[PDB]
Symmetry: D2
């Protein structure tokens, strides 16, 4: 059972909007919205969305596997060895948020301070003392963006696995000699940095020039979660505020995906007339180019929705019914909707991108969708006895060895319940960079934004005030 299986199981359920049923439902951890900073929903005047992995949650592991396969095919196409074609995506390996070290060809799981939690070279998980040879301080400077690439998006899951497969393959292929920084084949030297750049370029190519979108749209039921409660929640949002879409995707793809997402034999609820997806939005903006969107942005354009092409000219007019915009900036949204940043709840999955930038640059309120959380929460709740043991061990050690070996063992057994690279949010008792970023920049979070359906219009989401050590 993948995280998207959990999402689809919940998607198949009809909405019981009886107030006591709703109160009962959001008691359950899987239907809750979690709160890092207090948020009075009555003050939200505009609800904004990203599309990919937010409105359109791609099914796992099918979609990752498709991306993986097409990326492999592209690399072979440009000259990588035929053996790559024998690789097959394995969802049990990657966790989101890993760092690829282009100098030494390692995948690293780090905390918020750049401390090493896990280090794998290909499929070889490197123990603590061997890690010191390459990382003397068990630390990386993660903003050395020439060396380190942080694989923070769900689109980066296939390349996370592909990188490890490639390191493994070249290491074990007798044609290549393994060196500290890459592989030697006579008078050719393939650095890990060049290999990474080829992988990155290929993934980009698959998305922008290859067949990924075409293969997705030709089998939307295989690849995209669909939930009849989606128009219900969007219609409710539109009763109390404005609703907008701001997506990096182009109009043609957006239209295909959104049409699918709303393709039911009814509108907001069973028995109601179906309505086009566009009617659920006060403002639709495609080709957003986030994160540049949250700064200078790009020229505001208008989509000719008959052809899917841009009209000639920068668009200088007002918000009008039926118009679809392209490019622009976050200020476009504010201006056209008459909103100030704190009046906006922006809903998306890109934590290091949309969510961080909308918060830091514009003071928008944020809701982070974490598609994998459906599965993570299962594991967290099922294995809470392991975590509790780990807490007790840390506490007992501190108050003053055999205890350290036990801590290592429990840490490993806990982490392996999530996958080879462990939980998105931690390794044992140590939080990841990703966990830290969610706490810092996501006002609210959940496995799906559909969980807002279970809270009333003017709910006050509450978090405890943070105190300094001397104030506590």
């Amino acid at each position: 059972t993948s995280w998207s299986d959990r999402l689809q199981n919940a998607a198949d359920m009809p909405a019981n909007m009886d107030k006591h049923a709703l109160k009962k439902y959001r008691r359950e951890a899987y239907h809750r919205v979690f709160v890092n900073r207090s948020l009075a929903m009555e003050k939200i005047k505009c609800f904004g969305f990203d599309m990919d992995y937010t409105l359109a949650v791609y099914k796992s592991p099918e979609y990752e596997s498709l991306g993986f396969e097409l990326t492999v095919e592209r690399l072979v196409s440009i000259g990588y060895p035929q053996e790559l074609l024998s690789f097959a995506y394995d969802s049990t390996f990657p966790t989101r948020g890993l760092v690829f070290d282009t100098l030494y060809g390692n995948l690293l799981k780090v905390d918020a301070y750049g401390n090493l939690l896990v280090c794998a070279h290909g499929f070889n998980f490197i123990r603590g003392p061997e890690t010191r040879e390459q990382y003397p301080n068990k630390f990386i400077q993660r903003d050395d963006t020439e060396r380190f690439y942080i694989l923070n998006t769900l689109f980066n899951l296939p390349e996370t696995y592909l990188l490890a497969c490639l390191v493994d393959f070249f290491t074990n292929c007798p044609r290549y000699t393994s060196c500290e920084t890459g592989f030697k084949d006579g008078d050719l030297f393939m650095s890990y940095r060049s290999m990474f750049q080829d992988v990155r370029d290929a993934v980009d190519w698959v998305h922008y020039k290859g067949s990924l979108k075409e293969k997705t749209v030709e089998n939307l039921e295989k690849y995209v979660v669909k939930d009849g409660k989606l128009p219900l929640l969007l219609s409710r949002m539109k009763e109390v505020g404005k609703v907008f879409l701001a997506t990096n995707s182009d109009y043609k793809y957006t239209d295909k995906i959104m049409t699918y997402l709303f393709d039911f034999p009814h509108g907001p609820k069973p028995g109601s007339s179906h309505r086009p997806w566009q009617s659920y939005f006060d403002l639709i903006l495609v080709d957003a180019r986030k994160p540049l969107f949250f700064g200078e942005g790009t020229v505001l354009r208008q989509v000719d929705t008959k052809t899917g092409k841009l009209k000639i000219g920068t668009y200088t007019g007002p918000l009008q019914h039926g118009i679809v915009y392209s490019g622009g900036s976050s200020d476009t949204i504010c201006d056209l909707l008459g909103a100030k940043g704190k009046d906006i709840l922006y809903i998306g999955d890109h934590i290091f991108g949309d969510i961080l930038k909308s918060k830091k640059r514009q003071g928008w309120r944020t809701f982070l969708v974490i598609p994998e959380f459906a599965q993570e929460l299962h594991v967290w709740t099922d294995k809470s006895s392991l975590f509790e043991e780990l807490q007790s061990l840390d506490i007992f050690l501190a108050e003053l060895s055999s205890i350290q070996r036990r801590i290592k063992k429990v840490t490993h057994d806990m982490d392996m319940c999530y996958g080879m690279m462990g939980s998105l949010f931690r390794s044992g008792s140590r939080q990841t960079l990703f966990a830290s970023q969610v706490m810092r920049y996501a006002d609210l979070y959940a496995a799906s934004f559909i969980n807002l359906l279970y809270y009333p219009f003017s709910y006050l989401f509450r978090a405890a005030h943070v105190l300094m050590p001397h104030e506590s």
Copy 2:
């Protein structure tokens, strides 16, 4: 009673090193070290220091007043009006960490998200609704460094006050017409941005070219806290690890100040032979140019300690006894002392500078000295009933107006106990940017690093593990 009065009162006390006395002493909040992240002192192999406002804590408000007076004199010298000479420093106005908005000429106190807590234009504190005219979202983008300057150092206290004095003066002087972005005098327009740049340039000039250092060194008893326990703690550090100085100051000034700091008729303890200040350090580095120091740094040079001039040439040799270094980088320290970053505890007052950068760039452990904390902690403890009331009011409001007016009143009365710009760490129930940065980057903090004297050699400083909302 200023914060430096508190520091000097504690400095005058002899050290009772009986273990039970030490345990009793660090119970008291004023002699504690506070802990944001756990730190096992037994793992620290090197103790590093900054000088200014760390080893050499300048007395308040005398030193700020001197800086203020010399900066005013410099501005008048370059053509500012003679009326500036009637200004007098007032320590009850500035709090450290305010943001000068060069567009509208306001001092702003913000939270970690750029939300406005306080806004003053000159000496006029602007209420919430009037704040919306210039800050529609009650928010600033604090990394818009062309517009906003964050006054984060204690050296910035006099200019914090001077900026407000200047805005007040020009506003009320009939020769000038007050405009949105500056002041008009016929065919001359002085923007707030140009005024700020003159102030910044003048403060820099006073420190680097003017008489501030000369006036300080000619009356060190007036201007610099002195504590006989300083050589005791440094000598104890040197029994268990290496000790280093890394200061932006030049050798000649460093030598004057450090000689004063060690000028007692004894060495580490009463009855022991006096020893030169240099003997307490395994490595002395001046002209550090932090924060560039924590990246590429500058060429490593050697000081001719007879002349106080640099020797000709980049220094390419090993650590040797009696050598004093100039420039270099954080890697110099690591290389010469044989240390990895987590083996180092770096002690300084510059949170946004040395402490943040040493942590983020190098994974050093950090101890933040906060000179004003001696006074802040007094006020915090004396007015804890006001804070507790504020907590109860927030809690009562949330569980569902007259209560809001009460919250505003209590917030104001609490804040005014600290000064006109309130606590370094908060306004009412809201934490400042500065508080957030201390929590994030200072592993340990206190009003003085001398508080380490009260903890044993291998003490384990403990902080609770942070949990995400769904983990709690």
Copy 3:
């Protein structure tokens, strides 16, 4: 008769290598090599070439017309109006080296100092006094690269004409309102800058992603000049020095074009065995990325010549027979051939690019091919009586009005003999920027590098020494 007709007529002639015949032939202006700086051919050890418009001279106006048509089709494809499809390339309009002013939508012909010689808005040639409204000093700052784009390559001929066609079209189309900086259609505004960027992007797309290369290679006889003397000259060069190819083109295209260029039923001369094009080169380098090539370059790669794909890895080996390189830098050539810059004669058409950069960055000797010179020289020689009259008029005016009107008339009549935008090299008595750049950076120049065939192995090309005014 186009310039490429002249080149092909000369290409059809067999080579008479009798020394007296060769001496007679290079007497004629059309078969001469012209000399800006003295060059002793005996000191040249390496002859290097570009491919496009150097070895492979595209036929005119056919090739420009193809590029024009495909660029138009691309613009219509992305949403430009269908009326564009009625445009047809006109070779009598563009001259190479014009400046597009993206602010006001003008094509400008300038001198080396940025002084305006010609200004056309669409097809309206703007007289001197109307030019002052937009160019008060009849001057542009040509290095303001945000505003001005210099159309210096033969690939820029179709877009030169397309820009004028578009300005004309939008000006005369009643749907658009002509404004100073672009065109208004209700709530859409198309700036000249945005229009130019679309044109530039479309031309790039046609070359890199569209069908231009495919359409060229499917009818090479229509599109590419072919000369049996080419292998004769290259074989002679290889008797006295090394020969190299450095092209921005990819291997697959290079191979198609070069195979065509050498496809005769003989090798260097009639009666000799045919030899593959690769055998004429000591070093073949594709994907050169000039001008970056003349600085840091890119990673050196090796082409798998069976597949046309790159081999995996940076190539670290020596020059070997049959290897084809990709990327690298000008230092690659020097290292592998054992050459110093002044030992190299580099032959190309890109004056502002390859020729200027190889000279300035590396001190290479340069030979500039100017494909249009075959026609320009015809016109120059036929209309020399007009030029002589113009000289006499300038001289008579200076020694001290009706004469100015005559000067304007003769200038116009002369210029119109070349085309609507006049000579590549001048307007009347004033030299263009392009002329100045040829003099400054091309040691040698001619309509074809084949003219080197008519000079002996160790010929001394001589130019007069330049004297300052006080030295003369």
Copy 4:
């Protein structure tokens, strides 16, 4: 007899303004204005000047020697060896326009293409073949500004000589070991790059913070050429156009120097009332910050001429009588004087700076003052038989060894007549970079702008039209 002796001898002569006398006087090469591009004086509406080395020509070698001595004193002051104090300026060594190679510590004289003409390491002039070890292509990339510094101003004459003295000193001092890129003293290594940076910093310090200006103004007769014809020419300019000063110097220094320059017991001519220097200018601008001046410039300020300080505020008003401006941009001049660039003749000595930039950025007309030309022209005319022999030898060699040795000998003997580094304008038959830049960017040039006094109001300065080789 120095070049400034020649200038002062001509300065001492009264002006005979009889038209036939003026015609006779400017026949002589020393009183001529030389012409690179034609210039109709009747079209000039504004005459602009720099001050230093233009209006105020510093006497040689006295002024260079003063600068040299103060720079040496500063280096010794910051820790250079006492032996530096024995150096003494020698005007026979430096020629302006040399390139310091910070990698290998050489002074280089180059042509316009970066080809090496002369190479000296300290005082050792390196012959051609030894030059190849460090410069394999006898070429430098002169825009590699990290490595090469071009000493283009007369203020750079003392440091030109100082650099050679320092290389010589360290080479011959037994304490230092000479290495390829600097000097080793045990564990100290002084690179040539660090040595150059110290020299550059010291020269800057002498001008901006040291005593150079003070020592100059206390003995203006020793240090500054003075000519009673200066107010005569400026007064004549003001009869036909506007006159402006744009100087990088501050007001206080400008006022001292200009007051001296006009301190005669008369005004424009003997017998006329003296008038203040300011009355000769329609616009006076100080603190110009050229070359930034010719782009964005700096904020326009107004000088309080009573105090010599800036008034508070950006100046937003019109041109008014008696105002003195500070900062601003070249557009300030155009706006306030109502001029377009080609209406302006700008007169200065900084060829690579003011003259090049005003021409390239703004299309101003240019007059280059070359103070050394007074002496260079003497040598040129006296040794023209050597140059003529050299021309004959080059010509005889070309038409086809003993002749090459003769060419080298004559080249050396000619060059040595000018000084150790030869003529500003050439080495033998090869022109320097400086010569090329004068031809390219100075419309007019002479040893002094006073030579304009000898041409009538509406003189047409004529230069021959440049033709390409195929046009000739």
